[PDB]
Each structure stands twice: as C-alpha cells, then as structure tokens.
C-alpha cells in the first residue's frame, strides 16, 4: 500500500561465467531443421537463455534470413506443455529403469539378429546419427531402419531413379535463370533451400534506373500459394492434369512426350512457355514440385538437359539425405510387419506416427501388436500416450547435435542452455542401444566429428556456423531416355479432386501448440486458429448449390466496382460445413472461398485436429489425415461435397478482399519502366487531378531533419512473397501478446506489421494477388500525435514516432486518427503473467504491455538505442565527439527475417545509404499521400515482365 515499490530482491551468481559481461547479450551459431534439412541460425542468448533467432550470413540456405518456423522455435521451446519426465505407461519413471529395460530387451534380440527390433525416424541427415544407426545395424543384422515423415520428398528421389538410374540431389541457381517455370512447385515456400532460392529470385527481380534485365516466372498450380503471387503469369490448372501438362510441354519442345487434350487457355500457356524457352537456353530452369508424380520430375530433368540448362542453372550433387528412399512404401512395409505380428520391439524417434500416418494404414490399431513401443517426441504426443517408455526429447536449442542443409554443409547444432526438464537426444538413445548408457551428447558428436576434421576444425566450426570440409560433390549422371519415355503418364478425371497441402503456419502439425504460428494469419486466406476447405467461388456455387451466378464476377473496367460488391456479397457463404466423402471417410469441414483455386478442386490443409497437443491448439481444425491415403498422398480422385447447412464460425483478419479503386497498390510493366521509371506515378495523378504532379500543400511547418539522423524504411513490392516471416520476427522481438480466437473474432488481434492481399483484376475468379506489408509509416506530420491529450505519442529528434506505454491513459483516439490503422490496443489483459516459461521467453529490452495501453511499430527502437549508445561511446572513447552510425549497424527484426530482402532500413539523410538510394528511384511512393503525413516508410511500385504472346 505504501513505499511506492516493493523490496525487489536481486540474486547474482556464485561463480561468474568466464566470457559473459552481465547485461550484454551474446550470439551463438546453431542449426534448425525443418523437414530433416538444416538451416544455420544466429540465436541470441541474453543471460544464458535463447530469446531471438536470426539468419546466419555465413551459412548457405540462410544468408541472413530465416523462415517463420525458425522464428517460432523460440516459443516452441518455451512451451509449458513440453514433456518433463519419462513415462513407462503414463506413469512417471526414471532413466535408469528404462536403460535396464532396454538392455534386457536387446539381450533377447541378441539371441536373434534383431529381427524383432525396428526403428522409425524421420528424414535423417545428421552424419552422427546416421553413423550410429549404421553401427547398430551392423551389430543387429536383421534390424530395419524405416524412416518416414508426412512431408517428404519421395517423388523427387523416385523421379531421379527413373531418369538417371541413381540417387541425385538437384540444386537450382536462380541467379542465372532469366526464365523459370514451376510445375506445381512451391519453391518460394518454407522447404529445402527456401531462403537461398527466394533471395536469388528477389535480387533478380529488384529493378532500378540502371537496370536492364528482369526474370520471368511461369507457375502452374492447383491451389494458389506464395510462389503464384510473384508470378508474372499464373495458370490455375487441376492437380491431376499437371502430369499431362508436363508431357505436352516436353512434346512441344521437340522432345519425347505425349500430346494431351487441354483447354485453349492451357494451350496458349504451353505456347508462351515453349516460346520463351528455346530462346533462353542455359538461362532457364523447369522446376517440378514434390507433390507431382515421379514422371513429372523425370520429364523436367529431360527438358532441362535438352535445353542446355544443366551445369548452368540445374546442378546435380551426391545425395545429402543419408539413406534416400520411398518413405511411404517403407511405412506400408512396417505396418504390414506389425499386422503380421513379426515385430517385437518398435523404437520411434519423433515424427508422431499415430497422427501423421495415412488413415488407410491403421497405425494405432497395429501399434498394439508390438509389445514394446518407445518414443521420443519433445511433447506427450498422441503416439507417446499409446506407447510405453516415453522419453522426453531435448529441444534443438538445448542439445548437442549436427545436421545437413541442402547441397550438404554439415553444420553443428550448438546448445544455449542445459535441458530445462532434462531429456535426451537421438544419438544418446542410439548410444544406449549400442551398449553405451549414460553417454553425454557432447562427447558423442565431438567423438564423431573429431578424427575427421580435427580439434582445430571443431573449434572453427563452433566459431562460425558451417563446416568448410563437408559439401556434396558435383557429379554428372547419365539420362535414360527409354525409361522416361515408356511411362503411362496418368490423365485427370474421376470428378472433384482433393489436394492435400501443408498448412502455411503449422506444417505437419508439430507447431500446433505454438501460439505465434496458430495466430499468424495464413497467406491468401487470412484465417487464424482454424482449418477450412479452400475452393474457388465457381466450385462452391456448383457443388454446394449456393444461389449465385458466379459469372457476374466477370467483367471489364467499366463495372469493376460492381463486381467487387458482388464478391463481397458472395463472401457471405464462408463457413458452410461440407461433408467431403473421399475414400470411405467423411470429414465435415467448413468451406472457405479462395478465388485463384482451380475449378473442381478442393484444398485441405494438414496439421489440424490433434487431441494430445498443448493447451494451445488442443482441439482446433478438422483432421485431414484420416481421409489421406497411401496410394496418393497429395492428390485426390473423386469426392462428394454434400452441403449440410449448419454453419461454423470462421475468423479472418481482413474480411475485405478487394481494394475499392484506390491508390493502395501500384503495378507497372518492365518494358515501359525501362524508358521511364516514373510512369506509374505520372498515371493515377492524371486521372485524379489532370496533371502529372500532385501539388500537395500543407499548413504545418514540421521539423527540419537536415544535419541529424533520419530513420526510414523501404518495402519493395517486387520482392515480397507473403512468407509472414516478418510478423513472427516482430512478435518474437517486441513481446507482442497472443490473444484467443474469440478476441480475434471481435477484431482485436495485436500485430505491429500485417500483410494484405487484395485479389484484383478482371474475372475475380482468376485474380492477380497483391501482397503488401503495412506497419507504422512514421509520419513526419503524424496525425496520431495531435490528438492524444496526455502527450503519450510524440515525435523524436531522429524523426521517429515515440509511443510511450506508461503515459497512455487509453483514450483510443490515437487510433481513430491513424489513416493506416496500425495501432493496436490492449482492450483486456493479454500478456501472460502466470506461465513461467512464457515469462522466460520475453525480450528484456522491451516492456511488456499491460491492459489499457496502445502499441504500434517502433522501428525496433531497442536496436536503434543500442547502436546510438555504442556509437556515442566509441566516439568519446577515441576523443572525436563525432557520433557517426554505420549503414548496416541497425537492422530491424522484420529486415533480418525477410529471406527476399524486401525490407531496407537506414538513414534517410546519409545519401550513400541503401535506403537513400532506394528512395531516389522513380517508382518510390508513400501510401495515402493526399493526407499530408509525409511517411518515412515508403513502397517501391511493383513492376511486371509479361510476355508479348500472352498479353497481345
């Protein structure tokens, strides 16, 4: 009641760490794996605790950039639902008891040759684990490995075996690819080598005044994605007709294939693809998606070889996946051995087989046949609950290990903290099965990596983020024409198809407990906390019997606003439950309207419906894995939609999918941009004012900002792909709270940056998608500052917009005057207070907001203050009184996360800075300029490079 503040005790160390300065965060080089392939990350430890993850500039596949999963691994480690103890049968047990039971069980196996012993891991690329598994197989000859995961690359290795007769790894160097063609290949999505491909593609799309060339992207996909956004031409073909499309493409170029009866639009698309190809030989690449059948991969290799792209844009290396194999076939063989009762012991290392296996395999029922089941899941997953001897697994941020990225690099997974709840790694278990219990994970990876690179090599590897000796050698395989020519090449049919796609934020369902990813609005859909059956408007009209024409969305420029109003009226059918019958299964999942979807195709997103997940996501979405089948894991044949009425509430962060004829998004052509980079701005202003220049006049003086630092930001629309990595980075850096689905339904999501798609163009059933990131524009004449009565929002000496939490009384007037609506309010108590692990995840340099205050983008002021203090201290310690900040000294979290490099931050006044050079371009513009706000965050208009045969 008195004394203003309590006692606040302070507990220091008893022995100081040798290399740590208290109050100074440090950085460590580790590796994060997505689908078994590694990604070098630079992770920040504040006082021995991981808090932020950023890119490792020294590591390929992460040249200073990360994906949303690498950013969200921070909160995934701090989940309060992670496993803490060993469970024999749900009973808390010990590690020594499990070791004795494993040794006794393996003694019985020693009487045989391990015939009953079976393994079950995911896509393994770690050399240490692969060497220990091989040693265990030499000790037990009749044992089998059997690796499987729901998001695998079985079609890639199958196509490589069909074409070259051996296992090869295909790498794409997009930096020298003027024409790129994607056959249902979502290479701009989180996958193998996603950051490197997205960076090279973006740097080829960043056009300037002196620029002279620009690459072109062709994509053919069933459901639109991030790759289709950055495409100059997009063809919404069905998922089954893409194999026949590839055959027709190979046939048109004069190479062995098969002609196919296709639509006139697909015929004109084949024409243009073939014409732009053959004119860019060695400057082109054809990419086949992992979802497409093996024949599509083989035909793509053949097309690339004939065009001369091999050795220039397509490179072949030795396999980097340890054992490359058809994982679904090995899973069928394992469940067959389980049904026959041959297996006696089944050891699983992650992957959640009970939830991830296809529905027609009945993994849970056959799992009872094997008496001893053992699992390491890092959570109490569904499989561990139905298994004996559950062993908690150590998080990648608290364990020793290694991994291999695409093209092979063999980076080290360096821990940052002792395991919180204990928990062993995979190689520790493999050493336990090798008669070596109580083996330290440090000594295991250190013993394997020694005697190969040396002690000085291990020290250099820990210092940097890579190992310089390990890289996949370049090989030259031979192509088999007869095998790839004599292939059935399946044709579409059987009616409405189902396309199984990984969820953009949840992947295989591992991150269903992560609040940051579950709340992240999905790209192109903007849904949160839920799962839906995505279908085009025409498909929903025809199949669910909805009373709309779907032809009124077609029109010209004269009736564009009327078509947008009809699309608004049509969006009212979102939420209708549909009883999809695929192959003996009814799913009963609500529907959602995605305009770009191909007709007669429904996209179902994986990773929902879990029952033994954490408190977050414990019962979200409808499980699609039961209807998933082993014969076709990505495509479907025939389905029965069966509309049931019985609406379900779906929640979206935008609720309006069309810009109502305003100057929000600017698009141009490269041929006209070359002659004059300012032509887009000269347009609009003529149609709005009759002149080529808007003579905006203001009544306020503002401030000068001449000899001082002026912080500014530039967003390049030609590089944004909607990967939503900047949003998770902003959440992880600025302690942004996580509200429930109920609070998002009422429009109370808290996000300092948001990406908006606007589905614009003719037809509105085949629309171009425009993604645009929006944060605080930092208006020099900010209207949000002239309305807050307590002066809680003012302006900074450097032109920044100061939003002070402890002064806001919460009038909510600062938001109504914000033209861009980039201010979020704590209507209730949103920040977590009780959970200790979430309190450990908070960034100590940012205050955690309480109920009744406002938030908005602060240009990551903690990093600006740190660099300014460091610059002043370096200036006075040398006796200069200069105080000068380098260009790359400050990097906001959204700038570092972006794998494409679309966000550039720096000093406006320093003319040699990258931002000053970018803002001087002809296509640099600021949103809502008619309001004299003078924003410091500007946009670079999107420039397109379309073909003349398709446009004319």
């Amino acid at each position: 009641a008195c004394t203003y503040q309590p006692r606040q005790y302070i507990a220091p160390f008893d022995r100081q760490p040798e290399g740590r300065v208290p109050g100074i965060p440090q950085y460590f080089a580790s590796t994060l794996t997505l689908g078994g392939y590694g990604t070098g990350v630079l992770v920040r430890s504040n006082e021995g605790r991981p808090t932020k993850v950023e890119g490792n500039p020294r590591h390929p596949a992460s040249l200073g950039g990360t994906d949303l999963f690498a950013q969200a691994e921070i909160l995934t480690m701090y989940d309060p639902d992670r496993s803490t103890t060993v469970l024999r049968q749900g009973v808390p047990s010990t590690w020594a008891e499990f070791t004795t039971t494993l040794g006794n069980a393996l003694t019985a196996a020693r009487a045989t040759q391990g015939a009953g012993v079976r393994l079950l891991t995911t896509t393994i690329t770690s050399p240490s684990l692969a060497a220990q598994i091989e040693q265990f197989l030499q000790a037990y000859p009749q044992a089998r490995w059997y690796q499987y995961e729901p998001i695998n690359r079985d079609n890639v290795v199958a196509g490589a075996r069909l074409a070259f007769g051996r296992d090869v790894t295909t790498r794409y160097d997009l930096s020298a690819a003027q024409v790129v063609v994607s056959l249902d290949a979502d290479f701009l999505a989180p996958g193998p080598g996603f950051v490197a491909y997205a960076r090279a593609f973006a740097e080829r799309r960043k056009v300037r005044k002196d620029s002279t060339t620009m690459n072109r992207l062709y994509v053919v996909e069933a459901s639109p994605s991030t790759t289709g956004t950055a495409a100059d031409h997009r063809l919404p073909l069905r998922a089954d007709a893409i194999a026949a499309f590839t055959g027709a493409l190979a046939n048109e170029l004069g190479v062995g294939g098969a002609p196919a009866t296709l639509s006139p639009k697909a015929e004109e698309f084949l024409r243009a693809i073939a014409r732009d190809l053959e004119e860019h030989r060695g400057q082109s690449v054809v990419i086949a998606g992992d979802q497409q059948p093996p024949i599509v991969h083989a035909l793509a290799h053949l097309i690339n070889a004939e065009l001369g792209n091999v050795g220039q844009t397509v490179f072949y290396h030795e396999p980097v996946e340890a054992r490359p194999t058809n994982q679904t076939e090995e899973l069928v063989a394992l469940v067959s051995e389980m049904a026959a009762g041959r297996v006696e012991t089944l050891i699983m290392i992650g992957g959640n087989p009970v939830y991830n296996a296809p529905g027609d395999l009945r993994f849970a029922d056959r799992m009872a046949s094997v008496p001893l089941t053992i699992h390491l899941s890092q959570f109490v997953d569904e499989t561990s609950a139905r298994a004996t001897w559950h062993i908690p697994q150590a998080h990648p941020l608290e364990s020793w290990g290694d991994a291999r990225a695409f093209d092979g690099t063999a980076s080290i997974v360096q821990p940052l903290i002792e395991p919180l709840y204990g928990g062993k790694t995979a190689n520790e278990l493999l050493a336990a099965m090798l008669g070596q219990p109580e083996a330290e994970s440090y000594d295991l990876v250190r013993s394997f990596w020694l005697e190969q690179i040396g002690e000085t090599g291990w020290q250099v590897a820990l210092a940097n983020g890579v190992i310089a000796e390990t890289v996949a050698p370049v090989i030259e395989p031979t192509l088999n024409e007869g095998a790839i020519r004599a292939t059935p090449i399946p044709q579409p049919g059987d009616g409405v198809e189902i396309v199984f796609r990984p969820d953009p934020s949840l992947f295989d369902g591992f991150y269903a407990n992560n609040g940051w990813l579950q709340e992240l609005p999905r790209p192109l859909t903007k849904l949160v906390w839920d799962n839906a059956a995505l279908m085009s408007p025409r498909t929903a009209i025809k199949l669910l019997g909805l009373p709309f024409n779907a032809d009124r969305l077609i029109g010209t420029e004269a009736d564009d606003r009327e078509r947008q109003q009809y699309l608004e009226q049509l969006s009212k059918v979102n939420g209708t439950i549909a009883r999809i019958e695929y192959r003996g299964g009814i799913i009963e999942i609500p529907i959602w309207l995605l305009p770009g979807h191909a007709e007669d195709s429904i996209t179902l997103n994986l990773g929902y419906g879990r029952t033994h997940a954490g408190r977050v996501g414990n019962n979200v979405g409808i499980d699609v894995y039961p209807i998933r089948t082993s014969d076709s894991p990505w495509f479907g044949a025939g389905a029965r939609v069966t509309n049931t009425g019985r609406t379900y509430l779906l929640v979206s962060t935008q609720d309006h999918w069309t810009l109502e004829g305003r100057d929000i998004y600017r698009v141009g052509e490269f041929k006209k941009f070359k002659e004059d980079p300012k032509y887009i701005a000269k347009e609009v202003y003529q149609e709005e004012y009759g002149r080529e220049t808007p003579n905006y006049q203001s009544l306020q003086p503002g401030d000068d900002y001449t000899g001082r630092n002026a912080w500014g930001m530039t967003i390049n629309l030609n590089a944004c792909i909607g990967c939503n990595a900047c949003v998770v980075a902003c959440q992880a850096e600025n302690n942004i709270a996580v509200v429930g689905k109920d609070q998002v339904s009422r429009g109370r999501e808290m996000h300092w940056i948001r990406i908006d798609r606007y589905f614009a163009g003719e037809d509105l059933d085949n629309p171009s998608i425009y993604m645009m990131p929006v944060n605080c524009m930092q208006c020099e004449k900010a209207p949000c500052e002239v309305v807050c009565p307590v002066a809680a929002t003012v302006h900074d000496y450097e032109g920044l917009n100061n939003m002070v939490y402890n002064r806001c009384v919460g009038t909510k007037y600062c938001s109504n005057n914000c033209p861009y609506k980039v201010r979020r309010f704590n209507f209730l108590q949103y920040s977590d207070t009780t959970t200790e692990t979430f309190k450990l995840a908070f960034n100590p340099d940012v205050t955690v907001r309480i109920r009744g205050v406002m938030e908005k983008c602060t240009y990551c002021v903690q990093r600006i203050s740190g660099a300014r203090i460091a610059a002043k201290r370096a200036a006075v310690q040398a006796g200069q009184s200069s105080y000068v900040i380098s260009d790359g000294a400050i990097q906001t979290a959204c700038e570092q996360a972006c794998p494409t490099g679309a966000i550039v931050f720096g000093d406006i006044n320093d003319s040699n800075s990258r931002v000053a050079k970018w803002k001087a371009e002809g296509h640099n513009y600021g949103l809502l300029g008619f309001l004299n706000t003078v924003p410091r965050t500007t946009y670079l208009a999107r420039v397109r490079n379309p073909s003349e045969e398709l446009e004319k």
């Binding site: 109050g23 080089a29 021995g48 020290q459 692990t837």
Partner: protein, 164 residues
Amino acid sequence: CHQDMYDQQKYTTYEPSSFFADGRSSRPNVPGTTPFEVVKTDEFLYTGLIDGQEVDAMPFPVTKDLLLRGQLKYNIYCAVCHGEAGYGASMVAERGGIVPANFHQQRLREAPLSHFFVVITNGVYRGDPENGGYQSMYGYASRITPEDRWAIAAYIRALQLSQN
C-alpha cells in the same frame, strides 16, 4: 498507488526466478559452447602451456598501450591484497595473515611469463588430496580477460625491472 508496469513479467538481468532450481533467472555457461566468431584455436591466448610446461614467452608483442592496460588491471584486481608496488605490503595482509607473495624475490624473477598467466587463471595450488589443503591465490579466471591477463603479466615484468 499505480504499480502498473513498475514490475513486469519479463526477467531482467539478475531477477530471481522460481522456475529454476537454484533460484536464478541468469544461467551458467554450457561447458563446450563458444560464442559466434570466437575461435579457441590459439592455446597461448587461452593457456600458458605449449606442451604441459611453461615457455617464458608472450603470445603477442609488448605495446605501451598494452602495458598501460596491464597496469590498470593490476591496480584494480591485483594491487589490493597483494601489493601496490609488488612487495606484498597491503592492508589486507595485516588483517587475516594473508602473507601474499613478493614479486621481487629471485624465484619469481626467473619464473616464466606463462607461469604468471596460469597463476592468475587457476591460483597457487589447490587442496592436497591428503593431509588437507587450501587454495591461497584462489585464481582470477572469470573476472579477467586472457589478453588483460597477459598485459598484467607484462606489467609484473615491468615492475620487476623497475625495482632493479
């Protein structure tokens, strides 16, 4: 009368924590973990032994700024309890019977530089396994940077010369 964001859920530098066993939000160093772009290859930069023995040499050449930094680190950490000029006369030895070592004796005059480095790092001698034992110099590994340790050793040599 307010107490809103005065005490926050985030964990500051030394804020006590009830989630860990020892009641500390700050965490000790992972044994074999090194920071980013910090290579531990050079041994002289981190230990005074080239083959298990002393060398009477210094990893980098002596500089005037290096000697000044060594004098500063000596006056802060080493001068107290052990002598301002290196003779071992201090207020600390008066109360406690510390009797610290005298740098100007002939045994430490012929002693190698790396012997000074390993003494700052570890100490004088740990407790013997039999007949008891105790540490006297107690070491200064965590508080001093290895380069500052070499600068302190260079300043000890300068003090030994200044008294001859």
